[PDB]
Amino acid sequence: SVKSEYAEAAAVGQEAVAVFNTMKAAFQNGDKEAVAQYLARLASLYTRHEELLNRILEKARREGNKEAVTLMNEFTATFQTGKSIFNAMVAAFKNGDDDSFESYLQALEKVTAKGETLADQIAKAL
Numbered sequence: 349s350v351k352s353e354y355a356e357a358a359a360v361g362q363e364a365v366a367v368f369n370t371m372k373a374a375f376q377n378g379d380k381e382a383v384a385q386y387l388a389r390l391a392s393l394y395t396r397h398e399e400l401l402n403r404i405l406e407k408a409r410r411e412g413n414k415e416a417v418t419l420m421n422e423f424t425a426t427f428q429t430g431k432s433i434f435n436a437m438v439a440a441f442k443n444g445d446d447d448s449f450e451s452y453l454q455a456l457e458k459v460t461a462k463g464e465t466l467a468d469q470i471a472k473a474l
């Protein structure tokens with residue numbers, strides 16, 4: 349169902365949270381080789397997460413679950429914010445710009461954390 353497909357999406361999001369927090373520890377410890385690998389894994393996860401969300405949104409659309417569609421439109425907009433901050437974070441790492449990387453990392457945490465409450469309402473709605 350759409351509901352189980354969103355449970356799967358949610359788990360992938362939780363994976364990225366876990367990897368993000370390991371990455372943050374690695375950054376604080378100055379282990380750049382690890383961070384690079386974690387950043388690559390994060391991009392794969394976010395790309396997967398978005399694809400699962402899009403298919404779930406289109407399926408709630410075809411099913412006429414208007415309340416779910418509204419919430420998912422809002423969530424996928426906030427997803428793009430996350431994606432833009434993430435991509436800038438990656439670019440700062442490549443550039444060797446630790447102040448920006450810190451800033452984008454702090455800001456991405458808050459986007460994600462704030463996005464968690466909408467995530468939970470989508471669960472109940474589907």
Ligand SMILES: O=C(O)C(c1ccccc1)c1ccccc1
Binds near residue numbers: 429456459
């Ligand atoms: O996929 C997620 O778990 C997040 C995310 C993080 C970084 C880049 C893109 C998306 C997220 C955060 C807030 C709202 C929706 C999605």
